[PDB]
Amino acid sequence: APLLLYANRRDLRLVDATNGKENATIVVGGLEDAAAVDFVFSHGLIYWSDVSEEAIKRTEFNKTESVQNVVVSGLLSPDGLACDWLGEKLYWTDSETNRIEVSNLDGSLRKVLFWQELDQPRAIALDPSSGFMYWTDWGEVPKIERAGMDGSSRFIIINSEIYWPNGLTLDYEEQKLYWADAKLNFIHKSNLDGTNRQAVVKGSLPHPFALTLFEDILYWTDWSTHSILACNKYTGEGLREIHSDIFSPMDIHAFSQQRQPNATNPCGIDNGGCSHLCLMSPVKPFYQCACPTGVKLLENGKTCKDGATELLLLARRTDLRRISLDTPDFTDIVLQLEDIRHAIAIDYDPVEGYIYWTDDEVRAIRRSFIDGSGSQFVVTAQIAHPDGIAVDWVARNLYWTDTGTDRIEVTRLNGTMRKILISEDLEEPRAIVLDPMVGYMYWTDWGEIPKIERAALDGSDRVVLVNTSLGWPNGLALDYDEGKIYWGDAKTDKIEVMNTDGTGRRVLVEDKIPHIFGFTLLGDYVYWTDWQRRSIERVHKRSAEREVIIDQLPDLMGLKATNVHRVIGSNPCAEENGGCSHLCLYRPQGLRCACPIGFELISDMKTCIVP
Amino acid sequence: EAFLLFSRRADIRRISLETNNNNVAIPLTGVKEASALDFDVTDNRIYWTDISLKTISRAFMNGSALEHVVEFGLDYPEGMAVDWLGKNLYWADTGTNRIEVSKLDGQHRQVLVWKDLDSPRALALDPAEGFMYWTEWGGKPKIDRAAMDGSERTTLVPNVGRANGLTIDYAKRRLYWTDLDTNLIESSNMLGLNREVIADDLPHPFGLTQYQDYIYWTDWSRRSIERANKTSGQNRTIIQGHLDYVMDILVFHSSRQSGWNECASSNGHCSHLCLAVPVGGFVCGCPAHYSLNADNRTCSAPTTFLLFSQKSAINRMVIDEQQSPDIILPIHSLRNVRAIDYDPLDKQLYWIDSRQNMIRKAQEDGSQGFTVVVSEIQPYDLSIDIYSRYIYWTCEATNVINVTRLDGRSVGVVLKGEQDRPRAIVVNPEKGYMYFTNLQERSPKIERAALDGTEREVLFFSGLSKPIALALDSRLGKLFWADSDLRRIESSDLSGANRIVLEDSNILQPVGLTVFENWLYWIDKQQQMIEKIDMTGREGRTKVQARIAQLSDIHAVKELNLQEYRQHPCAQDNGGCSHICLVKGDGTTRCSCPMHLVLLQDELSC
Amino acid sequence: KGQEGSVCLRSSDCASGLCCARHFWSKICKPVLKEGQVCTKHRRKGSHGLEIFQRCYCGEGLSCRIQKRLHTCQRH
Ligand SMILES: *[C@@H]1O[C@H](CO[C@@H]2O[C@@H](C)[C@@H](O)[C@@H](O)[C@@H]2O)[C@@H](O[C@@H]2O[C@H](CO)[C@@H](O)[C@H](O)[C@H]2NC(C)=O)[C@H](O)[C@H]1NC(C)=O
Ligand SMILES: *[C@@H]1O[C@H](CO)[C@@H](O[C@@H]2O[C@H](CO)[C@@H](O)[C@H](O)[C@H]2NC(C)=O)[C@H](O)[C@H]1NC(C)=O
Ligand SMILES: *[C@@H]1O[C@H](CO)[C@@H](O[C@@H]2O[C@H](CO)[C@@H](O)[C@H](O)[C@H]2NC(C)=O)[C@H](O)[C@H]1NC(C)=O
Ligand SMILES: *[C@@H]1O[C@H](CO)[C@@H](O[C@@H]2O[C@H](CO)[C@@H](O)[C@H](O)[C@H]2NC(C)=O)[C@H](O)[C@H]1NC(C)=O
Ligand SMILES: *[C@@H]1O[C@H](CO)[C@@H](O[C@@H]2O[C@H](CO)[C@@H](O)[C@H](O)[C@H]2NC(C)=O)[C@H](O)[C@H]1NC(C)=O
Ligand SMILES: *[C@@H]1O[C@H](CO)[C@@H](O)[C@H](O)[C@H]1NC(C)=O
Ligand SMILES: *[C@@H]1O[C@H](CO)[C@@H](O)[C@H](O)[C@H]1NC(C)=O
Ligand SMILES: *[C@@H]1O[C@H](CO)[C@@H](O)[C@H](O)[C@H]1NC(C)=O
């Protein structure tokens, strides 16, 4: 007696028995807007997606409440869901982020498979027997696609006679795959290639939402009629509708251990496949090696590196996000954190892996471990508009500017030992960068006469680097072992470059530049935000040419491209803090020790006390 | 004691001649951007221009009596001076290129200089001698002089940059000014000769004034008010520091406004304006477009003139050999005019506000304003029947020809149709017909009918795409129309015979027509021009005015022949009719009614 | 497009023979200078920032040079 399992917006539901007594059982319930479901039968698992909660979840078939969040981030319209009962993975399409991804059956080791040339991918079917997953994306040009469940050999099989190509489901007995259509109102049928496209229920009668099957019988939903239907597997004949008066049936599967035929796993319980991900594959070994998103795989294969090497950190108004720079996929932002009101400036310390950032409604500086409970506060007192912040990763101090109080101030990274280095009456400090070797700190500031100044790392030797033809200078990156210093200006709308001493000057490109501007450099590339702050460009600093790595991301405020862990440069401050008991501030001549407000430097020129 | 007054954007302030002394703002209200500044010590009053408000205002030193004296036809009133003797207000506008004058309270405004003006900036008066001086900031800056009536204009000093703070040392007969291009303060006698440089080592001099043996100036760079020996340029001290954006400065003392002339006494017996002149003491003046009567003392308003409206203004211009400047009528009610007409009987101006969707009324004075149609209603065009005292108008919403009395009460609809869409309309009550454009979908046409809606007929249905304006000449029985799409002006007999194209070249967008004597005036929205052709063809197409933005309508006003007017059978008692009074071919009158009424046995009542 | 005196924001908002120059505390369309016409020459860099009565540049094939003290638009 085939049990049918189906989503229902408000709950997941199991029905059929032997098609009698109308025992539709509310498997899970109290959901909000459920779309897709699936199961791994052996483990007694039921998964679904929720479009209002933008999460994918799972429960235990037994009498229990047990529900676990499985994905709860990075999702917009997960409308297709397929469990891999063999390789033990979870696949799912998202029709609005236009991605296709995979994870372990606990949401972990989450890898993005495909993300290019996808228009509203929906229905999804796995063939763990082979290494083939099938799905349908539809849009300006609809199509059904095949590829390996490993990310390989993306083949377009059916690309004609389709419009809104509908539910996918495969006959393992016959090595044929069926599909429907939410517009042209047919059911078809082919071989697992694009081959032998036969009609099973041609003619405009079926208006199926989701197809399944069990022993010669095609079942499906027609939301309109609020019904479930069924007919011969071979012709349209037999077309009765199973008992169904159901409040918006969506996704549906035959809930039967027979619809998941078990077999040999391409990796054993041995190996566990690789180090992170063993995905099934058509390729000879029949399994393949994978790392999570943004993580590259060693030349040996089978072993994933540790995390990303470079990394592009975003600050939006109300969240932080990181894009990796190790992989082509890019637009995999991923975020974190709580109580972020209005983020402005961002920076990072590779040594301890703390992200530092400013928020100018909260009026505070904070730090975190990325996707880590890093979160502590750092500064919260006497702050106005922290429009720029810089980590000194050698002396282990934190610099930040302030627009409301027109100051530059330094503290140790933990916000201890605060000391005002610069406080100008007219001009007001905005964006700031550091050179802990060479002992310079450069910064843009606005004002009646907008200039770009520089000084030693204690504010001592003020030199005005740039003075003329600058309206509102914004970003300010630093190319180190090339001695150039890149910046922008909102008023004039052009990104210029310069010699480290203020001489090699020249427009690099013209650009319409936002007032709050994200702008950073790392490895030949420059990254900035567009005029509408919904997109980020990658530009060659040596080659001048532009590119857009991610759009449709509003409220971008500030960026920082950075190595993770990797650190460069040094000076004697790194030696037990220069011998200074509090603040050690490096200069070209040589370090100078300083003190928090109220303290006094003794003739040691090394020590502070309270008088 | 003599004290110093200066304008400073949002406020006007007073200080003493003493260094670092107290600096107090005159308690004024609603000042946005004060620029030009003068005073009237005898009346204890200050006058200032606001280039943001586009106005000239005055008030007492105690801030009381804040009133606007000029609030129309201003663009950039950068220059302004008080004639304390004749009690007149002079001002210059760099945007409108005009030097104007009026009474100190603002009435009887008149244009003194309008030709060959290229940005008049600063203005200094010498009513005792009958001369006025001003600086000019064109391609070739200069300092000109003229009689205080605008006569005898001549350049006094030609070799100068943008001069400012033009001030006269009356006692010692000299002129001082700053130069914004050479950063110096110069001086010369009242003839522009004996030209000396008082100070040259100045970074950014702007304002200027003098009193006794010192000159005071402002400096935008040093943010200051400094003074120095007026002849030497030395013994320099700073009076005030840290002053941002000091526009104009002046010395408030009685000794600055002395002297006398024939105008100070009974206003020279002048009916309106008393204007001092060097040779002859003074001359009597009149408001714009007014004529000075044979008595050399009184004025008469213009009898015939031409009205052209824009989006935000209605202008009047006369046809003189002198080419007198057009002026903006001071109607406060104006916002978005779409069409204009004029009742010569009561001498009042009618227009349609396209935004507030009403037909308003007011005399050229701007006073006696009154709404005659309000609301759905969406008036498109109007045509006044001056005999029956009726307005025939068209509604873009209900697609009808509606007729309303001048006082506000309705007569009724005279034309309504399922597929009919009346737009442009002109009534010819002398013959008993009305003419209008009927913009039916995909087949535009020009029609005629009796003033009651009967005897409809199509005059023209081909050679049309956008019949956009109508005009007729009752005396010559001619009809004129303009087509926006076909870019041409056509003519015909009232009957519709003898259709002839008048002009079909170098036209882009005609939107208004009007007959003035033997000429056909029309306005081109895109070309931004007023042009005219001779209906007789004897003389050639002539440009009247260029660079007029957002032209909406133009309308000729001829002097009403009261006697010839009363000859009309509907002139009095409306021909004994209750509603519409039609004129038979034999000069006899019937009575008709709107669409909703019927003529009774009285053959007079509806 | 913008005519002389018309409020503008960029020279592109103005007509062919005009540029967007500031007058007081907004910008309006002003005409380009022609041969013989007086042009602006700033002494101090800062005087440029303070100018509220801005002239347009010299027209095509004209250079702002000194007379042979004012500066006028002259041909190369
Ligand atoms: C503000 O001042 C006006 C007018 O100035 C007055 O008269 C000047 C000639 C000069 O003597 C000033 O010091 C005077 O203040 C005042 O208007 C006058 O008010 C008085 C008394 O009410 C009245 O008799 C006059 O006719 C008014 N007009 C003139 C021209 O004298 C006005 O009262 C003052 N306002 C305030 C609030 O004090
Ligand atoms: C479930 O599938 C697994 C994987 O095929 C089966 O486990 C073993 O599979 C190998 C592969 O051929 C067989 O040789 C063994 O005989 C299987 N285990 C044994 C000893 O039974 C497993 O049999 C399947 N479960 C069932 C019974 O359906
Ligand atoms: C951050 O604060 C910690 C304590 O919360 C500081 O740790 C030591 O503090 C003492 C007291 O001034 C100093 O003498 C030591 O030098 C600090 N240790 C180190 C590592 O230098 C610490 O100074 C602050 N920041 C650092 C440097 O960790
Ligand atoms: C920005 O402007 C200031 C002030 O004009 C420059 O400082 C001095 O400028 C004068 C000329 O105005 C020179 O004679 C000096 O040589 C400048 N200072 C010195 C001694 O270097 C300043 O140089 C300008 N900023 C830059 C460097 O572009
Ligand atoms: C024609 O004009 C008259 C006004 O001149 C309009 O008459 C108004 O009609 C409304 C009803 O729709 C009454 O409430 C108003 O009181 C009337 N106004 C006056 C002053 O009488 C009329 O609406 C216009 N159009 C038509 C089609 O009749
Ligand atoms: C101004 O200069 C003149 C001569 O240059 C001199 O007679 C006079 O004393 C100076 N100052 C004053 C206050 O008059
Ligand atoms: C002005 O300066 C001159 C010398 O430069 C001096 O002789 C004279 O006394 C000063 N003041 C007056 C009022 O003359
Ligand atoms: C008007 O002026 C003329 C010319 O000066 C003069 O002949 C005539 O007498 C004057 N009329 C008067 C004063 O009534």
Side-chain angles (χ1 to χ4, degrees), chain B residues 491-505:
Chain B
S491 140
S492 83
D493 276 26
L494 266 24
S495 64
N498 200 31
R499 175 173 181 172
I500 300 180
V501 177
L502 293 182
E503 192 62 37
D504 61 13
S505 56

mmCIF file of all heavy atoms in Angstrom, chain B residues 491-505:
data_model
loop_
_atom_site.group_PDB
_atom_site.id
_atom_site.type_symbol
_atom_site.label_atom_id
_atom_site.label_comp_id
_atom_site.label_asym_id
_atom_site.label_seq_id
_atom_site.Cartn_x
_atom_site.Cartn_y
_atom_site.Cartn_z
ATOM 1 N N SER B 491 -5.470 80.075 -42.772
ATOM 2 C CA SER B 491 -6.527 81.077 -42.682
ATOM 3 C C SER B 491 -7.711 80.706 -43.571
ATOM 4 O O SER B 491 -7.587 79.882 -44.475
ATOM 5 C CB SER B 491 -5.979 82.449 -43.084
ATOM 6 O OG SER B 491 -6.913 83.163 -43.873
ATOM 7 N N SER B 492 -8.861 81.321 -43.307
ATOM 8 C CA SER B 492 -10.039 81.112 -44.142
ATOM 9 C C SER B 492 -11.126 82.123 -43.827
ATOM 10 O O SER B 492 -11.041 82.863 -42.849
ATOM 11 C CB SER B 492 -10.607 79.709 -43.935
ATOM 12 O OG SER B 492 -11.438 79.669 -42.787
ATOM 13 N N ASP B 493 -12.152 82.154 -44.668
ATOM 14 C CA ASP B 493 -13.330 82.949 -44.378
ATOM 15 C C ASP B 493 -14.104 82.270 -43.265
ATOM 16 O O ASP B 493 -13.990 81.062 -43.065
ATOM 17 C CB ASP B 493 -14.208 83.084 -45.619
ATOM 18 C CG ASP B 493 -13.760 84.207 -46.533
ATOM 19 O OD1 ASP B 493 -12.563 84.560 -46.511
ATOM 20 O OD2 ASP B 493 -14.611 84.739 -47.273
ATOM 21 N N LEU B 494 -14.885 83.048 -42.528
ATOM 22 C CA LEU B 494 -15.709 82.493 -41.465
ATOM 23 C C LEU B 494 -16.595 81.380 -42.014
ATOM 24 O O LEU B 494 -16.933 80.436 -41.300
ATOM 25 C CB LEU B 494 -16.549 83.591 -40.809
ATOM 26 C CG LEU B 494 -15.966 84.246 -39.552
ATOM 27 C CD1 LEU B 494 -14.455 84.121 -39.499
ATOM 28 C CD2 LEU B 494 -16.395 85.701 -39.451
ATOM 29 N N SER B 495 -16.955 81.493 -43.289
ATOM 30 C CA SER B 495 -17.776 80.489 -43.958
ATOM 31 C C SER B 495 -17.002 79.191 -44.141
ATOM 32 O O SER B 495 -17.582 78.105 -44.131
ATOM 33 C CB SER B 495 -18.234 81.000 -45.322
ATOM 34 O OG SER B 495 -17.122 81.208 -46.180
ATOM 35 N N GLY B 496 -15.689 79.314 -44.309
ATOM 36 C CA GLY B 496 -14.836 78.163 -44.536
ATOM 37 C C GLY B 496 -14.262 78.139 -45.939
ATOM 38 O O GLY B 496 -13.517 77.231 -46.303
ATOM 39 N N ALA B 497 -14.612 79.142 -46.735
ATOM 40 C CA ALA B 497 -14.093 79.254 -48.094
ATOM 41 C C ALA B 497 -12.740 79.959 -48.106
ATOM 42 O O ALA B 497 -12.369 80.626 -47.141
ATOM 43 C CB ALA B 497 -15.085 79.996 -48.978
ATOM 44 N N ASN B 498 -12.005 79.797 -49.201
ATOM 45 C CA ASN B 498 -10.739 80.491 -49.392
ATOM 46 C C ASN B 498 -9.678 80.088 -48.367
ATOM 47 O O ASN B 498 -9.001 80.937 -47.791
ATOM 48 C CB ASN B 498 -10.954 82.011 -49.374
ATOM 49 C CG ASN B 498 -9.814 82.772 -50.019
ATOM 50 O OD1 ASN B 498 -9.166 82.278 -50.944
ATOM 51 N ND2 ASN B 498 -9.560 83.981 -49.533
ATOM 52 N N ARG B 499 -9.543 78.783 -48.150
ATOM 53 C CA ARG B 499 -8.535 78.251 -47.236
ATOM 54 C C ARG B 499 -7.132 78.476 -47.784
ATOM 55 O O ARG B 499 -6.812 78.038 -48.892
ATOM 56 C CB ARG B 499 -8.764 76.760 -46.999
ATOM 57 C CG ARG B 499 -7.690 76.099 -46.150
ATOM 58 C CD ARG B 499 -8.070 74.668 -45.828
ATOM 59 N NE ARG B 499 -7.077 74.003 -44.990
ATOM 60 C CZ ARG B 499 -7.253 72.802 -44.449
ATOM 61 N NH1 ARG B 499 -8.383 72.139 -44.659
ATOM 62 N NH2 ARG B 499 -6.300 72.265 -43.696
ATOM 63 N N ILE B 500 -6.299 79.149 -46.999
ATOM 64 C CA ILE B 500 -4.961 79.527 -47.438
ATOM 65 C C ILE B 500 -3.930 79.362 -46.326
ATOM 66 O O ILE B 500 -4.144 79.797 -45.194
ATOM 67 C CB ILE B 500 -4.931 80.997 -47.932
ATOM 68 C CG1 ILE B 500 -5.899 81.186 -49.101
ATOM 69 C CG2 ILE B 500 -3.523 81.406 -48.334
ATOM 70 C CD1 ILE B 500 -5.937 82.597 -49.635
ATOM 71 N N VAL B 501 -2.811 78.727 -46.656
ATOM 72 C CA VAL B 501 -1.690 78.612 -45.729
ATOM 73 C C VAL B 501 -0.919 79.932 -45.654
ATOM 74 O O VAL B 501 -0.451 80.444 -46.668
ATOM 75 C CB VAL B 501 -0.727 77.493 -46.157
ATOM 76 C CG1 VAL B 501 0.479 77.437 -45.230
ATOM 77 C CG2 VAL B 501 -1.449 76.158 -46.181
ATOM 78 N N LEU B 502 -0.789 80.475 -44.449
ATOM 79 C CA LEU B 502 -0.068 81.728 -44.250
ATOM 80 C C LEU B 502 1.423 81.486 -44.096
ATOM 81 O O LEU B 502 2.238 82.094 -44.789
ATOM 82 C CB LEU B 502 -0.594 82.471 -43.024
ATOM 83 C CG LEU B 502 -2.018 83.009 -43.120
ATOM 84 C CD1 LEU B 502 -2.378 83.766 -41.854
ATOM 85 C CD2 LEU B 502 -2.164 83.899 -44.343
ATOM 86 N N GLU B 503 1.777 80.599 -43.176
ATOM 87 C CA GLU B 503 3.173 80.291 -42.912
ATOM 88 C C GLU B 503 3.336 78.809 -42.600
ATOM 89 O O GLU B 503 2.593 78.250 -41.794
ATOM 90 C CB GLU B 503 3.692 81.139 -41.749
ATOM 91 C CG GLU B 503 5.196 81.099 -41.588
ATOM 92 C CD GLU B 503 5.924 81.652 -42.798
ATOM 93 O OE1 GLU B 503 5.431 82.636 -43.393
ATOM 94 O OE2 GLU B 503 6.984 81.103 -43.155
ATOM 95 N N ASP B 504 4.302 78.172 -43.256
ATOM 96 C CA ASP B 504 4.551 76.749 -43.046
ATOM 97 C C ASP B 504 6.042 76.435 -43.035
ATOM 98 O O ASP B 504 6.443 75.285 -43.202
ATOM 99 C CB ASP B 504 3.825 75.897 -44.099
ATOM 100 C CG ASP B 504 4.270 76.203 -45.519
ATOM 101 O OD1 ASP B 504 5.297 76.890 -45.696
ATOM 102 O OD2 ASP B 504 3.592 75.746 -46.464
ATOM 103 N N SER B 505 6.856 77.468 -42.834
ATOM 104 C CA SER B 505 8.303 77.296 -42.751
ATOM 105 C C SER B 505 8.875 77.948 -41.493
ATOM 106 O O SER B 505 8.403 78.993 -41.054
ATOM 107 C CB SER B 505 8.996 77.849 -44.002
ATOM 108 O OG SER B 505 8.658 79.206 -44.221
#
